[PDB]
Amino acid sequence: PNVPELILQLLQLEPEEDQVRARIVGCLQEPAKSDQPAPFSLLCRMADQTFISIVDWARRCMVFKELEVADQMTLLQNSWSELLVLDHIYRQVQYGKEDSILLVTGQEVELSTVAVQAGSLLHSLVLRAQELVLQLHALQLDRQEFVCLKFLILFSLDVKFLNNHSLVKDAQEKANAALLDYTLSHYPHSGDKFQQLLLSLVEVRALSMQAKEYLYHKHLGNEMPRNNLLIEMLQAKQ
Template sequence: MMTFMHSELSHTDVSSSPQQFLRLLCRMVDQLLFLMVEWARNSSFFKDIKVEDQMKLLHNSWSEILILDFIYRQIHNIWGKDIISPNGQSIGFDVLDKLGLMDVKAKVFELIKKGKELKMDFNEYMCLKFLILLNPDVSSLENRSYVEGSQEKVNAALFQYCMQCYPSVGDKFSQLLMRLPEIRLISIRMEDFLYFKHMSNEVPDQTLLTEMLQAKRLG
């Protein structure tokens, strides 16, 4: 992934061209989706789920997981208000304004701020990731009880971890869970935005990203 970013960004000033940034964003998301699917299929709980249910869960959760991944990386990197590419190029978040995503930028900044205040660590981040993935409310699951039981185990593990490792922060568990609806709102907004761009032929077609965008709407 780092090699891909370096090769794409080394000769492109995406900060000055919103459309170039959009195309690059879609290609990066496509690459990240392949990595995410590979992670999920080899992860605890999920690898024991039937393929049909796996696909339904991934179609439902992919955008939320990618946003959580991005937020976590921003929390633990001193990037200020810019994204720094591997070759040192600064991509300002202001490019989102040029794409009409001012509301998304504001929500992302707020989530990063809250995550830093909570000092979200890796274990908490991974628990949130599994809570998003293992959603028993996804329609037409064949083994809903297994998914629900798995999510409950992750939820209990997160609660116990917060109580044992951060006893002085009594509401950390609930504060972490409160971030999930905020992530979902951003994911819905971004999916709608990307789907509109896809229907307008402004983003690459026949990719894993477009497959994911279409799957939720056709489902």
């Protein structure tokens, strides 16, 4: 089978997993201060750091690097939560264990731990994400479809919410063509994998919206000098 040029470009832009982990862990293992209660503070910084890696990834991305910062900010403003969710989901697909979840740090959490420690919103969101994990495993989601889905999500904003329409609209069209062409060539006996994958993105967006609600309900404070990128993303307006 042949692999769409856009996908091959995306595979060259994928960070090395252990380097991403080592960097995140190094930040997390710093002598900490005293304001929210464990384990939340640590996990929150972890998510923050994961998004930082994601931003770094987007800065190396073909069409993204071109755009004016105003637009870059707007794309990331629209997609940050979905990128994080997709990152988490894909981590679980590779991990392949129904009983626990794997975090970006290599740390592993029992679903039975979540059942007792987690509020109802958080608990129902984690379990809902495991369902999507099972679906995508059964669909044989691979690394090529993954990086392409990340790219699609990144550029998922209706271009009317942007200043420049041209470059982003084309990018959307190229990525959609690449995913279709790849699923047809590499998974001919699946039939509508292309559609089924785009349908997955609908559930990613739904999980992403519940994730923001959980965070909103934390009633987080603004920062003196801002320290947490995700906090900024969460409080950012339209």
